Amino acid sequence: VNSFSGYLKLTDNVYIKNADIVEEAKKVKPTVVVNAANVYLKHGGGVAGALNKATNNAMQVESDDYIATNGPLKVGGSCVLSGHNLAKHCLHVVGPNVNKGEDIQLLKSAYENFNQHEVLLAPLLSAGIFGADPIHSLRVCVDTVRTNVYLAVFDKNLYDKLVSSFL
Numbered sequence: 001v002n003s004f005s006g007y008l009k010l011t012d013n014v015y016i017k018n019a020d021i022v023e024e025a026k027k028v029k030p031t032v033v034v035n036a037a038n039v040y041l042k043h044g045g046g047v048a049g050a051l052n053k054a055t056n057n058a059m060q061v062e063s064d065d066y067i068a069t070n071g072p073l074k075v076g077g078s079c080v081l082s083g084h085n086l087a088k089h090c091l092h093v094v095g096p097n098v099n100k101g102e103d104i105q106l107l108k109s110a111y112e113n114f115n116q117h118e119v120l121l122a123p124l125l126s127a128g129i130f131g132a133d134p135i136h137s138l139r140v141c142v143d144t145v146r147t148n149v150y151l152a153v154f155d156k157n158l159y160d161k162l163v164s165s166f167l
């Protein structure tokens with residue numbers, strides 16, 4: 001049993017809810033929250049900008065030190081950093097950004113990072129400002145992640161479309 005409430009069950013391991021991931025993280029304090037990161041961990045907008053704002057910029061300060069030491073992530077890659085006030089840990093995962101021309105096949109590689117964690121609160125990778133089809137992102141998630149993932153979808157209209165169209 002876990003603390004997540006109000007989710008619709010899509011599969012054995014994937015759950016979904018219309019929720020603001022920031023507000024959900026603050027309520028649940030999950031072991032892992034996933035950030036929709038870019039390779040520079042520049043948390044300007046979308047999910048990343050919202051998570052970072054909720055940490056009062058402490059996520060960005062920590063991320064800048066990570067990049068100064070390690071250099072940029074790979075598209076499809078990830079790193080584990082602090083969850084600050086939102087979670088124990090933040091898994092920063094880089095899905096491909098269609099608005100930069102990145103290979104959508106890298107979305108499966110991105111989701112494979114989730115398998116290193118038994119339970120996660122996450123957004124749909126490569127959705128929102130990264131420009132990919134969220135229906136596709138949900139299908140890749142279900143067909144890739146084997147650990148227990150609780151997906152937060154900010155937009156109610158999109159949530160209802162994801163559920164209604166789910167095979």
Ligand SMILES: NCCc1c[nH]cn1
Pocket residue numbers: 020021022046047050128154
């Ligand atoms: N408060 C809205 C956070 C968010 C979710 N998705 C994109 N941004």
